[PDB]
Design a protein around this ligand. Structure first.
Ligand SMILES: CC(C)CN(C[C@@H](O)[C@H](Cc1ccccc1)NC(=O)O[C@H]1CO[C@H]2OCC[C@H]21)S(=O)(=O)c1ccc(N)cc1
Lengths: 99, 99
């Protein structure tokens, strides 16, 4: 589809069998999801945003469906104000910015 | 132009007579620029994101040239780690997310 930006570009994602809302975020290098249980071992990571750094748990090879598109990659889990789909997964679904 | 997301989508902008590099950021509601001087009255505001909130100065009706495209809108000035072009100005240049 072709999404305009007059409103927040929110889509529905499915992760761990649950439906959630997430933001298509070209400004995020990484995909960050609010606290939840994901399978496997996690690794530590520090993520810097607009108001400082937060510590997150990094999970790899996670399966996630984004607006009907399947992606398999790294997902960070931490205290984010909203679920964010970053470039690492946007590239897998073939997203581009056009103007 | 059609921008891929393998790397950060950085473009050249001209604001307040100065040339700067900025991120085309679909996850940002508003445009936030690093500390600089702009003419006009301004209002204080608090913007929140990952890591917490920061205090900024809100300037209205500011003219920015994004990748050679003229646009006008609110610009926030504050201690952001990078210059961000948000949805308020992406809409003006006709930017869309496609996949
Ligand atoms: C958290 C989102 C809802 C909003 N953020 C925009 C977002 O695109 C930022 C924009 C951004 C980009 C770089 C530095 C600071 C902020 N990215 C970000 O926080 O990404 C983090 C996770 O991936 C990592 O790679 C980028 C930093 C990490 S935001 O910077 O806090 C923001 C909030 C309000 C406005 N008006 C404009 C921007």
């Amino acid at each position: 589809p072709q999404i305009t930006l007059w409103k927040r570009p929110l889509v529905t994602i499915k992760i761990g069998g649950q439906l959630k809302e997430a933001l298509l975020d070209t400004g995020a290098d990484d995909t960050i999801i609010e606290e939840m249980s994901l399978p496997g071992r996690w690794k530590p990571k520090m993520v810097g945003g607009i108001g400082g750094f937060i510590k997150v748990r990094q999970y790899d090879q996670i399966i996630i469906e984004i607006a009907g598109h399947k992606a398999i990659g790294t997902v960070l889990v931490g205290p984010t104000p909203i679920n964010i789909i970053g470039r690492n997964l946007l590239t897998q679904i073939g997203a581009t910015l056009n103007f």
